[PDB]
Amino acid sequence: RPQSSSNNSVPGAPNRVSFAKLREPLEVPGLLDVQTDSFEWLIGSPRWRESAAERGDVNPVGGLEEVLYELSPIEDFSGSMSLSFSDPRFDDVKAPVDECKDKDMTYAAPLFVTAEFINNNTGEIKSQTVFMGDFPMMTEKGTFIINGTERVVVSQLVRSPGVYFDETIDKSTDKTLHSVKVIPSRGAWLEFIDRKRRQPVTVLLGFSEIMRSTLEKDNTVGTDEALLDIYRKLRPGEPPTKESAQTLLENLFFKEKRYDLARVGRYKVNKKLGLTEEDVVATIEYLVRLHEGQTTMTVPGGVEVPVETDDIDHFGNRRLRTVGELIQNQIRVGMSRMERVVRERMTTQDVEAITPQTLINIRPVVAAIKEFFGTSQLSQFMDQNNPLSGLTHKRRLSALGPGGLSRERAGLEVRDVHPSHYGRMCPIETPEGPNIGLIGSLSVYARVNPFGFIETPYRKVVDGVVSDEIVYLTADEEDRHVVAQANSPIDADGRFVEPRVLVRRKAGEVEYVPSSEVDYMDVSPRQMVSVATAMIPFLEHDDANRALMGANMQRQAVPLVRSEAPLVGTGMELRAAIDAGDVVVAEESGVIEEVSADYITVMHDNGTRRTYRMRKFARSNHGTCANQCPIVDAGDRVEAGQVIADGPCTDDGEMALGKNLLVAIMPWEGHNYEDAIILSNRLVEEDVLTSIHIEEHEIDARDTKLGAEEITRDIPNISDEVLADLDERGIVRIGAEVRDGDILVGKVTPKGETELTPEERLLRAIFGEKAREVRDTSLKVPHGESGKVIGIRVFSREDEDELPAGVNELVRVYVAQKRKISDGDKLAGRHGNKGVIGKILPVEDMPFLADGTPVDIILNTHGVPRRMNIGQILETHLGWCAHSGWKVDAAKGVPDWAARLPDELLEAQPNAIVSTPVFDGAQEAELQGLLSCTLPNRDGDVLVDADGKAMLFDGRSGEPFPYPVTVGYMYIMKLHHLVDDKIHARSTGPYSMITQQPLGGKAQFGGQRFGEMECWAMQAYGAAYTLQELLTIKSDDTVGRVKVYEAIVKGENIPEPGIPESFKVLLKELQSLCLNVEVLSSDGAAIELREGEDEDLERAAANLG
Amino acid sequence: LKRLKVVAAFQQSGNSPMGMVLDAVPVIPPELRPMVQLDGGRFATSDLNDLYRRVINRNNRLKRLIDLGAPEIIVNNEKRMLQESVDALFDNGRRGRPVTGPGNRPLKSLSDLLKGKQGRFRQNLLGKRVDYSGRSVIVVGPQLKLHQCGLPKLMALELFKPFVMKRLVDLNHAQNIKSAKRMVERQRPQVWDVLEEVIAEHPVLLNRAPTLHRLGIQAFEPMLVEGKAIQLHPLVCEAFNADFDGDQMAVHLPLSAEAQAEARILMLSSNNILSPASGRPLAMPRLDMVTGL
Amino acid sequence: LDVNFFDELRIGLATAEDIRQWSYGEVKKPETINYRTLKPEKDGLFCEKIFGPTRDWECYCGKYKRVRFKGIICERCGVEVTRAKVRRERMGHIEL
Amino acid sequence: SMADVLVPPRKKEILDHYEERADKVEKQFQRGALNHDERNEALVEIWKEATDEVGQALREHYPDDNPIITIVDSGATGNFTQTRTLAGMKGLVTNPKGEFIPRPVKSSFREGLTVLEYFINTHGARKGLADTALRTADSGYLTRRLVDVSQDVIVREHDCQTERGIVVELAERAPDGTLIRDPYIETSAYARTLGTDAVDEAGNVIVERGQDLGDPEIDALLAAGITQVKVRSVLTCATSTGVCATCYGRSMATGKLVDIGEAVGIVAAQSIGEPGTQLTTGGLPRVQELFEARVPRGKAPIADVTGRVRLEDGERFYKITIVPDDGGEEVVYDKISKRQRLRVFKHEDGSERVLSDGDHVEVGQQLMEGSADPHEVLRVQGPREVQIHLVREVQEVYRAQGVSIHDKHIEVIVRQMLRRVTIIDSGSTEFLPGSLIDRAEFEAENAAGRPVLMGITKASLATDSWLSAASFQETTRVLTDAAINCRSDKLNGLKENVIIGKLIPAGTGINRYRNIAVQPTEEARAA
Ligand SMILES: [Zn+2]
Ligand SMILES: [Zn+2]
């Protein structure tokens, strides 16, 4: 295939012709490597062993091996014995992935280590294989299964350990004062101690003149005074010994168990100064040299050290803790607690009968792993709306979590784009809300260091000749060399065609320098953008805010019942879908032996067989439908890497998040007013925006005060007609159509005899009914839900099924809903243009082209220009070209506008899929040229003119619209904000037992929050009775609400409101604070607040007669 | 002077200063500090139960130490722990490190219920959740008159449910009111005529958060509309700052004659054209409308 | 039962006499409810003898469950038979 | 359409020309004859000029019936800066720190940006979004404090019949016979009740007192050559609590005189806070600085008394002395930094110039350029002056951002700031020294006290309602003090009534409207 076709490296890839004018020197690495490489490092896998042999240190050490080598010399106070660890080994997996998801298990493999005990008294050596617990495993997709739910461990942005200098300008005299801080990996931080203010610089002991005047504040005599002042200043506890507290203080700067030298941190301070105490002294010298400006730093043995301020937001000072390092740290905690247990068990026991099995207790380790994957903010519910959301979730770089910074502590300086993020963290894709700047995404080519620093590939240039040698540079290393943009003319032999190339300066500035002085060059124009950002066509034509919204909304697209790849792509779609994993890929080449909707089996040339089972109508974490379908036929030959089956939001292997829609940019009768969107009813009738949403309903039968609940088909006061779709157990039947209020699982709960109505008790006593009284607790379909039952799963105590204490039976019902696009659903393009459907018109109402084709979607003109996304227009134009095909006129030779076009874009067939990579995409002039050579329709009519505009008829009156309207094809996604989920209404419903206000939330059938600002609005209107009614009889007035319902049902006047329960609760809280709060009447007496019990009894008794 | 303010305060008010030292701690009723079992057998208690429990355990151990004739150092340690636990009960973290639960989370004290934006003062008193209310996504209403709003049929049927039941029993569609409830819940076809009847000239309130000024809440005459989306008049968007990107709005049904009168008169959409701030027209045309004219 | 005629709301320090007058009893036990029976333990934070019954007109021991007994105090378990509503208005106390 | 976006024909030559200027600045910096801040300053002026020029050529090349032009120039939506960014060029982009980057973005989003231009643009876009996210929270907080201070202010009576008011400028007399209309007429003159009759020097009163002062009244006043009008406002209103309908004047929403039940403090707080998300001390923190009555940063002193000025010249800072003309002792100021410029003003001799040595200064004349301390203005110039000053400054901040808020709304808050006085000497009464007592209690119980300016927060916490004060801020402190002082909350206010479920004492809730007899007439019952 030609160089113009994108994704030439992927077998069976669709042919998508690219407008890119620049060759791609380096392919995109595995987009999941940020996960899999880290976890393989933690395990010490053979793959990581090979990678570390090639590109890593000569001595490889895995994460587990590192923790064990740290913990290996365990010695007691006597030193007569030691217990060592080594050689981490893993068994096979307890259960496969689908079984763990189904059974609510944890995907894990047993961990074993070799434990060696030595007895220095008798010389015995006891080597024993110890079971260290079930170790949660990472899947091929870069996830974990914890309690059956798939989870992603997000990489965390933290500061590297080291010494960081800054100068602060004081308010007095505006003087320059340099403040220094030393960040350890573990242990207490130091400043120029551990939160103790007033710490003298003199108590620890031009340049020597300011240090000399600094030394004049307190005299120093001997090794006593300074160490006693440090001892008493450290802790307020009564001084035990000045000397012994001096040595115990010396434990803080020396002992590796207390003060842990950071391997990465030691590399940072060493790379800063020199190749302990000498580091401290060199730090004082660095600060002294910072007091009076110096471009060189000197110390004993030190040389070639620059003196400079340290920017703590720079990516040389800011590293990543990947999944492997986070797990390694929690393992270190658990192993430390286990080591305390080991030292505790060593001193007291019989040294002859001890074994490594006896000393080792794995409870704190397993509890550490459990507490991590369970309770950690970095262990996250995997976001699967579509493959792109999960993929970007695995590449997410988060600044929050334990060890990071809080949301409140985050200022605007940590959020904004830093110049060292280039090629490392995408400047575009970040959350739009309060998390902006605290959550990034890894850039397409970026890679994490063994120390946790993000690198980027660069092209090494020798004497102005661009080479194919690739070098990965840290931001530190990038701040030395001069790096050139990827867009620049080059000779066919690798020479730089222009005399000089533009560059990024070391400080983060822009400069122009001759080619012989340029070191490195960008590998790709998309190097800086993330995966989702790289999928936005004409990204360079959109402003950064709108492009941010587009990148974020692609992750919100819902899988449609049928996926359609976009006519206008950037070329990132294929690798995005493949690396995401939700597509099925052939591991080995061969021929398809058999193919069904259930599975594909491929016969390899070895005679071996591989069968791939399809996920069919599976419910994702967010309720979208994950459905795989084979794209291969029986006799087909496939290759390793080729896509066998499409997944959710995939068409022939490429990410397909939406549909190509015929668009018309124009105001239409106020129905597209203010970002509202108009759709053709065709999109409803032909199901082009339709999606499947699967809901999991769960109910259990447990033990109560009055005894066990029962799941049963026999429900009192319930007709046989509404029990029709239930089986003999009372569970709805597979294939049943369930609607609002229908019974899913019948359940009864024991009731008390005091809870019967007087009439019910009259029946029970008259007929001598059963002693068991029950209430109908059956699981019912919530409001606004419809669908068919696609699955039933049932668990019982009668079997071996593990259930929580008290729970006898647990049944889950899965309901699948086919959702056609509706008024109120949210749509968006890739450029950040978005809105809700405000009208869905009959097909005959839509504006239609001269040939009678109705447009699919009408976007309002006023929305486009001010949002500063013009790509949506550009794409539209290109879309139409790709839709209609084109033939460029070469008869007299290639026109100058097509000169830079590859020979494959000089003509295209109708419905041609096309790639316009970001920053390399289709140029303005080339697009304008293509608009002229567009092929006609079946009648020879050219429907769209050279401007991109067509003449449309009004489908209502019939008159033609007087001016040509821009029409074309735009790629529109159905966002996961859907009116079916949003609509909620309540007249009356459940209330809280605590505050006696209506419950909140739609799932609870809750009421709307009327807040403080809404009360301000009510008061500004002067509406007293509306405000009082809202806050009394409509909320917490317990008698007022029932009496109001009576009044409405009887057609009477609404009664006078009572006293809110909130005020009584306030008084009870004040009293619980020992505040005596009494409500005084006019005469000065204290009123007592209660309610008469006889009223309900008088009415209830008079009811019968 | 500063000492005189507090000493004189205790002198004139009749407060016995002995009230600052407590021999008995009140206990709040259990419904305000409930305990509910979750799915999975676990139980969930308000932090108040753990605070009270710590005070109880330390107090009972103090009694045991007084009976056992323990050393004065041990008894004193228990007394200090008791004072610190009552401190954590009243105001947690005001002195020392706060008492924490699992995950090293400071427990919420009695003082925390009265403080902050999430306390019982701000969001349990000045505002509350209400009945006869709903919400949905808003779409543009161009065919509406300024005093009207489109209401999704099911939303209106739920909001007006008691009125529809009463008018349903007035006619013979429902035998009694309970069967009327059963018919409205099942959406029997007889309810749409009656619904359209009770809707008539009964105003509803629409609100879009945040409410910046009183025009953030306005009264409209609802009319039954197709679909699940609320249809909003294009002229009030400026007042609500309503863009249709997925913005949602809330509906509230005034019940009493006074509330309905306030909606029709005070808060009606067409009765407020002008900015309450500058007096300039808000319901004035903008965007496409301007273009057309 | 009462419209709001409230003229003013007064707040002052509560003495131990006030706290003991508010109290329907002293909470002497750390226990909450029984794990097997889901019944509030006696003299606990949820104890029914002081804070009131959990179920309408039902004493803790079960000798009286019915409306006929309304107002009486059970001689066995000491629980008043009344509406469980009172469980939100009834304060306990702790003797330090 | 891509065709509908027109590109300037000379863009390449314009940008090349200004690039040659920029290259000259580069050579100037290479010689060491230019400072780095001066290099960036010159480059920023160069590329500002270039962006202006490509903007001009852009507007020149566009036909007026073009859709992109039509949309902006009709007022429908958008502005021409967006059109220039789209078609012409993006221009200078801000640093992460907020500084302009010396290299502009020369591309337009029609051309598409290069990699480096896009990356640079992300700084300004990102910091913009973040700054919006914080600004909404801060504006909401200021609105909440405005509500808490003003929410009990309602219109309690039709007219208090006070003759007090303020002078408002209707116009200025140019050297020509023409009359220059006052820019503040919309928010100052318009929608006020006339305090005293406006009479032209040539004849009859054109507008009677107690009139709405609408556009017809303003046009008749200007046609009659009336350059000033005295109006009634809530600042001068004589009602003890709340304000009278006649002093507050017209309700902005209804267009008629404000109704009795109306609660104008909440309307005022909402009217001030609703635009607050548009405010970018120069910004919204200046509004908070004024409403909180904080001693401003960059304080500019004022003259305590009329007299001659001895100006002392020094390198580090200015030192000012004043010899009064009444015969009193010299008032000696000091500690005026050299970064503070001298105030330019009209002296008593009738010249427009900077403050110089040996001038003559009147009472309250601003000595230095900056923001005056409203506390000092209160002592020197009296209580009625600080109201005008504060309203004018707040209105300066809100007008500089293009937001139109009428003066009366600010006057409700400012009125709530002056409500109390300090007791310096107890004398015969029971007031404690240094305590802040309401003006009504101080005058009725009357012995020595002085007017005090309070921040809206401090004035809020000083309310007579402990229940209301506890729900605002510092709940623990409020409840401790209220408990020790055995305070009794009178339960009259719209926040207290909301808490206990009582009709708010405003609008339909006041006793006049609340209790009313309604019965049909005999004639109607007959038919
Ligand atoms: Zn009993
Ligand atoms: Zn007045």
Author numbering:
A (entry chain C): 23 to 214, 226 to 238, 253 to 322, 334 to 1163
B (entry chain D): 293 to 585
C (entry chain D): 2 to 97
D (entry chain D): 732 to 1011, 1025 to 1190, 1201 to 1281
The authors write:
After forming a complex with the RNA polymerase (RNAP) core enzyme, σ factors guide RNAP to promoter DNA, open double-stranded DNA (dsDNA) to form a transcription bubble, facilitate synthesis of initial short RNA transcripts, and later assist in promoter escape. The ECF σ factors are the largest family of alternative σ factors. Mycobacterium tuberculosis has 10 ECF σ factors (σC, σD, σE, σG, σH, σI, σJ, σK, σL, and σM); deletion of ECF σ factors from M. tuberculosis results in attenuated disease progression (e.g., sigC and sigD) or in alleviated virulence (e.g., sigE and sigH).
Here we report the crystal structure of an ECF σ factor-RNAP holoenzyme comprising M. tuberculosis RNAP and σH at 2.70 Å resolution. σH2 (residues 22–99) and σH4 (residues 140–195) fold into independent helical domains. The “specificity loop” (residues 72–79 in σH2) known to be essential for recognition of the −10 element is disordered (no electron density), in contrast to the pre-organized specificity loop in the σA-RNAP holoenzyme. Lacking σ1.2, the domain that forms extensive interactions with the specificity loop of σA, probably accounts for the disordered conformation of the specificity loop in σH. As occurs in σA2, the σH2 domain resides in a cleft between the RNAP-β lobe and the RNAP-β′ coiled-coil (β′CC) and makes extensive electrostatic interactions with the latter. The σH4 domain enfolds the flap-tip helix of the RNAP-β subunit (βFTH). Surprisingly, we discovered another anchor point for the σH4 domain on RNAP—a C-terminal helix of the RNAP-β subunit (βCTH; residues 1145–1157). Our structure shows that the linker region of σH dives into the active site cleft and emerges out from the RNA exit channel of RNAP. This interaction creates an entry channel for template ssDNA loading into the active site cleft during RPo formation, but blocks the exit pathway of extending RNA during subsequent transcription initiation events. In the crystal structure of σH-RNAP, the specificity loop, which recognizes the T−9(nt) is disordered; and the RNAP-β gate loop is too far away from the σH2 to form the G−5(nt) pocket.
